[PDB]
Amino acid sequence: SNPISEEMNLKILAYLGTKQGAKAVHIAQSLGAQRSEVNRHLYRMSEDGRVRKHPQHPVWYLP
């Protein structure tokens, strides 16, 4: 595993600031980053209340 990067966090935040909101795929596309790393950073940031998401809580289920 690789550690969390505050630089990536800040890049994500800068991107989101310019939008009404964005899905992780678009964030990753703009940043030229992996969607997985972007998501990984988004979750952690959400824990610190640095980002939010709609809806707040998804419903999980089985395939």
Place this chain on the structure above:
Amino acid sequence: PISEEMNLKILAYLGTKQGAKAVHIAQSLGAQRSEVNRHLYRMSEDGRVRKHPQHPVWYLPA
């Protein structure tokens, strides 16, 4: 740190429901929400679980 036992407990719980939010899963399993979410997203990567909606919209708080 991912436990397959925790994964299986989550799956067993989700099986009996139409679906559930992480808070309810955590409370039912007697676990913390953070751990449950960790396992849920890890399993999501592997396609062992899914969520509605699949792609949330992220934004900044004010």
